[PDB]
Design a protein around this nucleic acid. Structure first.
Length: 240
RNA sequence: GGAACGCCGCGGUCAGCUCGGCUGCUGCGAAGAGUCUCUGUUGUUCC
């Protein structure tokens, strides 16, 4: 659907870590793929219209930043672990979940947003902060496209087709807001919820609580890896 | 306020090519979304 409850099986599930259609092997997402995921639907075989085609570099940059973001490490920082006792260390420690205060799982999401989303996309710091505000509220509920704004459309140059700041008609402003709405919607509905659906088992009591079983979660990430690998092998290795 | 595409400003989430740029066709030019608030505007043209 588009909730973020009832799973923390790890970052291997995160949208930005899906691989594109294995035409002679499965490859990691390119800017053009992310663009198609945000503004069309990613499962568009045809070519991108020039306006969107010109934004393949920023989205490629987002992917880069995502790939260098160390989510595990930010998580550990913002959601510190309660130290169990020696004698609980090991198996029991991996059976017992670790709660993370809601404001803290928000702080995680906040810093990840800051890490991976290029600034050119925010347009203004004012736009970033307003969005964080929505995220803050989003993370407490269980909101609409129009409701998502004290957001300054003319701050985002990237919505332009050409970088000439000549006068534009109403129809443009509309088309610009639409594009921005689509991206901010994906940032909220795609990135944010993907994030918490990946790193936290979240549950509702009317407060959301966030749990985590890191080690078990990391084993899931690792097990995924060996699984898809065993898959490829079987497809390459001969009969008999 | 009604119109318009020659002038010039901004487009087409649309179509052809043998296609990341050409041309074909084609829209808009100061209000739009919410329900007073958020995002926005000098001056294209014609009466």
């Amino acid at each position: 659907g588009s909730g973020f409850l009832y799973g923390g099986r790890g970052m291997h599930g995160f949208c930005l870590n899906r691989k594109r259609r294995t035409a002679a092997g499965p490859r990691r997402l390119q800017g053009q793929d992310l663009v198609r995921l945000v503004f069309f639907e990613g499962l568009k075989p045809k070519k991108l219209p020039l306006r969107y085609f010109n934004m393949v570099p920023v989205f490629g940059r987002l992917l880069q930043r995502h790939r260098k973001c160390r989510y595990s490490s930010v998580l550990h920082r913002m959601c510190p672990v309660v130290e169990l006792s020696r004698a609980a260390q090991g198996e029991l420690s991996s059976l017992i979940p670790q709660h993370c205060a809601p404001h803290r799982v928000y702080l995680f999401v906040r810093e990840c947003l800051t890490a991976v989303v290029p600034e050119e996309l925010w347009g203004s710091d004012h736009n970033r902060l307003q969005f964080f505000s929505r995220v803050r509220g989003f993370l407490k509920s269980g909101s609409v496209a129009e409701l998502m704004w004290k957001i300054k459309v003319m701050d985002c140059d990237w919505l332009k087709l050409r970088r000439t700041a000549g006068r534009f008609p109403p129809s443009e402003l509309a088309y610009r807001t639409r594009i921005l709405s689509q991206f901010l919607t994906w940032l909220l509905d795609g990135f944010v919820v993907g994030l918490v659906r990946a790193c936290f088992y979240a549950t509702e009591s009317n407060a959301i609580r966030f749990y985590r079983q890191e080690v078990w979660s990391k084993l899931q990430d690792l097990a995924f890896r060996r699984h898809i690998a065993k898959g490829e092998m079987e497809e390459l290795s001969p009969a008999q």
